C-alpha cells in the first residue's frame, strides 16, 4: 500500500436558528466536540488508555476491548458531542491516534412547550420530527470538504486545504407565537389533569393569514432529554389523530343550506319526536325535547333530525362541496412527516343514510388542523387562506369558498350557540363575544370532546380547536381564547 494518500474529511455546517414569529429562539445549534481515533496509532499508547477512557466516561476494559477488536481499522468514533471544554481536555492528553471534529448539537430553549411543532434532530444533526424535518434542507446548509494527507498506517500527516467551505443553514421564523403557545400548553395540561384525561390537542390559527399561532399536544416530552421517552409522548396528535368530527361540521352543512336558495335562518324544521326513520335506519337526536326549531336552534340543540331533513332537501352534493372546499379530508400542504389527510368519501348516488351521516359529521374523518383550517375559512368571512407553519409577511389571495353573506349569517348562528339560553355557556370568553360549536368525535384507526370556534364573533381574528381524548373542551377554549386575544391586543367587543 502507498506511503502517502490524499483523503477527504467532511466539515459539518452550522444548522439554521429556528425562532418564533417574534424572533424568540426555539432551536439553536450549540458547538460540540467529537473525538475519532486511528486504532493502529492508539495501539502504540496502551498505558494512556485508562486515563483516556475516564475522560470519555467509558469503562476501562470495555474501552480497551473496543480498541483491540478494531486494531485492523484506521478510523473509529471514540465519542460524539462532548462540550468544547471537555474535548479540549482530551486533546490536551496528546494520546497518539486521537483526533477531534468540531460539530453542532441542538438546544431547544422552550423544551416540552413546543416539542411537537419544532421537533428534533438525530445523532447526525438531521431533522427527525416536526419543523426540523419539514425544513431540513433550509436549516441544514451544506457540509464542507477538507483534504488531509495520510501515510500507509492511516496517520494524518497534515491538513492540506479546505476544497469546499461549509455553508451555514438559514434562519427560520415560525408562525408560532411562543406567548400563545405557553398559554395553550399550560391550559390544556391543567384541563387534562383536572379532568383525569390522558391526551389532547389545541390548535390556534390566525384566520386572516393562515398562520398556526399555537399547536400543543399532550402528552409531550422534553426534546433536550429523550432518555425515558415514551412513543405515546412523541405523537403529533393535532396533525395525525383522525376522527369523525360530529356536530362540529354542522356549520358547513348549514352553509350549504343557506347557499342553496331554499333556506333562511328564520326557517323552521319539525324534529319531533327526536327520531326519524329512513328505511331500516333510525336517526336519533341527543336531546329529544323539541318540535319546531329554527335553523339556529337546530345548531344549539345539535339536532341530527333537523340537519338531516335540511340535507335531504338540498342534497348531499352541496354539503360535500362545502366540506371539500374548506379542506376537510384534504392535504394541508404543511409537509410534516406523519401528517394524515383523513377521508371525505364521495358518491355518485347519495342514499338518505349516507346524506344524513355526512350532514351530522359521522360520514367523514378529519384532523384537528383540518377542522381549525375550516373554522378559519368560515371566520375569515368565507375566504380560505393556505395553512402556514412559517411567519407570513405577504398574505396569499386565498379562495372565496363560502359567500361573505352566508359566512356572516353562520358566524351569527355560532355566536348564538355560545351565548343563547340552552347554549354552550362554558365556551363564553371573558371580555369578548365568541362563536363556536361542541361535538363528540369518534376516533378512526374511542371518543374525543371537541370544541371549535373563533373570536371575536362580530370581527373574527382567531380560530381554535380543542380536542380532549374521552363538554370539558369548552372551558379550555374559553380560557385560551381570552388570553390569546389579549396577547394580540384585540379590542374587547
CATH number at residue 484: 3.30.450.330
Helix (H, G, I), strand (E, B) or coil at 47: helix
Give the SS3 label for residue 465: strand
Q: Which three cell numbers stand for residue 340?
A: 394524515
Residue 48 in any domain: the answer is: yes
Q: Determined by which method? A: X-ray
Scanning 57-170, the segments in alpha helix (DSSP H) are: 60-69, 84-91, 115-118, 130-134, 136-140
Specify whether 25 is located in the same domain as 166.
Answer: yes
Same domain membership, residue 273 and residue 314: yes
With a CB cutoff of 8 Å and minimum separation 6, the contacts of 351 are none
Cell digits for 43?
Answer: 495501539
Structure-block grid coordinates of residue 248: 362540529
Do 181 and 165 fall into the same domain? no
C-alpha cell, 309: 331533513
DSSP string, 136-150: HHHHH-B-EEEEEEE
Give a yes or no: residue 392 inside a domain. yes
Do the beta carbons of residue 204 and residue 453 sit within 8 Å? no
H or E segment and range at residue 316: helix 316-325
Cα angle 49, 53, 58 (rounded to 5 degrees) comes to 145
Q: Provide the residue range defining the domain that includes 132.
A: 2-175
Buried b vs exposed e over 423-452: b needs ≥16 C-beta within 10 Å? bbebbbbeebbbbbbbbbbeeeeeebbbbb
Residues 65 and 156 in one domain: yes
Closest CA to 472 of 217, 192, 264, 218: 192
To the nearest 10 degrees (0 to 180), the angle between helices 404-419 and 368-379 is: 110
Closest CA to 258 of 208, 299, 302, 304: 299
| Coil/strand/helix, residue 244 | strand
CB distance 354 to 183 below 8 Å = no
Question: Do 195 and 294 lie in a common domain?
Answer: no
Quick one: 193 and 267 in the same domain? Answer: no
Number of CB atoms found within 10 A of residue 189's CB: 17
Q: Which three cell numbers stand for residue 437?
A: 360549536
Instruction: Measure Cα distances from 59 to 46, 92, 98, 464, 483 in Å.
Output: 15, 20, 17, 53, 52
Closest by Cα among 304, 308, 295 to 267: 295
Any domain includes 231: no
User: How far is 22 from 387, CA to CA, in rounded Å?
Assistant: 19
Q: What is the resolution of this structure in A?
A: 1.4
The Cα–Cα gap between 201 and 116 comes to 11
DSSP labels, 374-429: HHHHHHTTTEE---BSB--SS----EE-S-HHHHHHHHHHHHHHHHSTTS-GGGPP
- Of 395, 417, 439, the position where a domain reaches its end is 417
Q: What 8-state DSSP symbol labels residue 171? A: P
Q: Are strands 383-384 and 399-400 parallel, antiparallel or unpaired?
A: antiparallel
- Look at residues 372, 385, 342, 387 and name the one whose alpha carbon lies nearest to residue 450: 372
Query: How many CA atoms does the CB half-sphere of 137 hold within 13 Å?
Result: 1
d(CA 464, CA 471): 16
Nearest to 115 by CA among 31, 231, 233, 22: 233
Is 445 among the domain residues?
yes
Residue 287 domain flag: yes
Domain end call among 362, 387, 417? 417
- Cell (9 digits) for 489: 391586543
Helix (H) or strand (E) holding 257, with range, is: helix 250-259
How many whole angstroms separate alpha carbon 177 and alpha carbon 204? 10
Domain boundary among 374, 390, 417: 417
Considering the domain architecture, whether residues 315 and 358 belong to the same structural domain is answered as yes
Residue 229 lies in a domain: no
Say whether both 154 and 183 belong to one domain.
no
352 and 399, same structural domain?
yes
Residue 5 phi/psi, 5° resolution? -150, 135
Residues involved in catalysis: 247
Burial (CB < 10 A; 0-12, 13-18, 19+), residue 280, is exposed
Residue 424 lies in a domain: yes
CATH number at residue 364: 3.40.710.10
Q: How far is CA 147 from CA 5, 161, 218, 430, in A?
A: 10, 5, 48, 65
Cβ neighbourhood burial of 71 (10 Å; 0-12, 13-18, 19+): exposed
Q: Say which residue the cell 479540549 belongs to.
A: 88
Residues 6+ apart with CB under 8 A from 76: 36, 37, 39, 66, 70
- Shared domain for 310 and 410, answered yes or no, is yes
Q: For the beta carbon of residue 408, count every other beta carbon within 10 angstroms.
A: 13
Exposure pattern of 204-220 as b/e (b: 16+ CB <10 Å)?
Answer: bbbbbbbbbbbbbbbbb
- Let me know whether 254 and 399 are in one domain: yes
Please count the structural domains in the chain: 3
- Measure the CA–CA gap between 411 and 102, rounded to whole angstroms: 57
The reply to whether 258 falls in a domain is yes
Residues 6 or more apart in contact with residue 303 via CB below 8 angstroms: 269, 271, 274, 285, 287, 290, 293, 297
H-state helical runs in 24-79? 39-42, 49-56, 60-69
CB atoms < 10 A from the CB of 82, how many?
Answer: 22
Q: Contact, 385 vs 345, CB < 8 A?
A: no
Q: For residues 245 and 394, state if they share a domain.
A: yes
Amino acid at each position: 500500500d502507498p506511503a502517502r494518500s490524499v483523503r477527504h474529511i467532511a466539515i459539518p455546517a452550522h444548522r439554521g436558528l429556528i425562532t418564533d414569529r417574534n424572533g424568540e429562539p426555539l432551536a439553536v445549534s450549540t458547538p460540540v466536540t467529537t473525538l475519532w481515533a486511528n486504532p493502529k496509532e492508539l495501539m502504540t499508547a496502551k498505558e494512556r488508555w485508562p486515563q483516556l477512557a475516564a475522560a470519555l466516561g467509558q469503562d476501562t476494559k470495555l474501552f480497551a476491548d473496543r480498541i483491540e477488536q478494531n486494531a485492523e481499522r484506521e478510523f473509529i468514533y471514540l465519542v460524539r458531542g462532548l462540550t468544547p471544554e471537555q474535548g479540549e481536555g482530551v486533546i490536551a492528553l496528546k494520546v497518539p491516534g486521537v483526533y477531534s471534529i468540531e460539530e453542532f448539537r441542538r438546544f431547544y430553549p422552550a423544551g416540552e412547550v413546543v416539542a411537537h411543532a419544532v421537533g428534533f434532530t438525530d445523532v447526525d444533526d438531521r431533522g427527525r420530527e416536526g419543523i426540523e424535518l419539514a425544513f431540513d434542507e433550509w436549516l441544514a446548509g451544506v457540509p464542507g470538504k477538507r483534504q488531509v494527507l495520510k501515510d500507509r498506517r492511516g496517520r494524518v500527516i497534515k491538513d492540506v486545504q479546505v476544497t469546499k467551505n461549509a455553508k451555514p443553514g438559514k434562519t427560520l421564523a415560525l408562525s408560532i407565537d411562543l406567548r400563545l403557545q405557553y398559554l395553550a400548553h399550560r391550559e390544556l395540561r391543567n384541563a387534562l389533569l383536572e379532568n383525569g384525561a390522558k391526551a389532547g390537542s389545541l390548535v390556534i390559527m390566525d384566520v386572516k393569514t393562515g398562520e398556526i399561532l399555537a399547536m400543543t399536544n399532550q402528552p409531550t416530552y422534553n426534546p433536550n432529554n429523550r432518555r425515558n421517552l415514551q412513543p405515546a409522548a412523541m405523537r403529533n396528535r393535532a396533525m395525525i389523530d383522525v376522527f369523525e368530527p360530529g356536530s362540529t361540521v354542522k356549520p358547513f352543512s348549514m352553509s350549504a343550506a343557506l347557499a342553496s336558495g331554499r333556506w333562511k335562518p328564520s326557517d323552521i324544521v319539525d324534529v319531533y319526536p327526536g327520531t326519524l326513520q329512513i328505511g331500516r335506519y333510525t336517526i336519533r337526536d341527543v336531546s329529544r325535547n323539541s318540535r319546531q326549531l329554527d335553523l339556529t336552534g337546530i345548531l344549539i340543540k345539535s339536532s341530527n333530525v333537523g340537519i338531516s331533513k335540511i340535507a335531504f332537501d338540498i342534497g348531499a352534493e352541496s354539503i360535500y362541496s362545502v366540506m371539500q372546499q374548506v379542506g376537510l379530508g384534504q392535504d394541508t400542504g404543511l409537509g410534516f412527516p406523519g401528517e394524515r389527510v383523513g377521508n371525505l368519501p364521495n358518491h355518485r348516488k347519495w342514499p338518505k343514510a349516507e346524506t344524513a351521516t355526512l350532514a351530522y359529521g359521522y360520514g367523514l374523518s378529519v384532523t384537528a388542523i383540518q377542522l381549525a383550517h375550516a373554522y378559519a375559512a368560515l371566520a375569515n368571512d368565507g375566504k380560505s387562506v393556505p395553512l402556514s407553519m412559517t411567519r407570513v409577511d405577504r398574505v396569499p389571495d386565498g379562495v372565496q369558498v363560502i359567500s361573505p353573506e352566508v359566512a356572516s349569517t353562520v358566524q351569527g348562528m355560532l355566536q348564538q350557540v355560545v351565548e343563547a339560553q340552552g347554549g354552550v355557556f362554558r365556551a363564553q370568553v371573558p371580555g369578548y363575544h365568541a362563536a363556536g360549536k361542541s361535538g363528540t368525535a369518534r376516533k378512526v384507526s374511542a371518543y374525543r370532546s371537541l370544541f371549535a370556534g373563533f373570536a371575536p364573533a362580530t370581527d373574527p381574528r382567531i380560530a381554535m380547536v380543542v380536542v380532549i381524548d374521552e363538554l370539558v373542551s369548552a372551558p379550555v377554549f374559553s380560557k385560551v381564547m381570552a388570553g390569546a386575544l389579549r396577547l394580540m391586543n384585540v379590542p374587547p367587543d
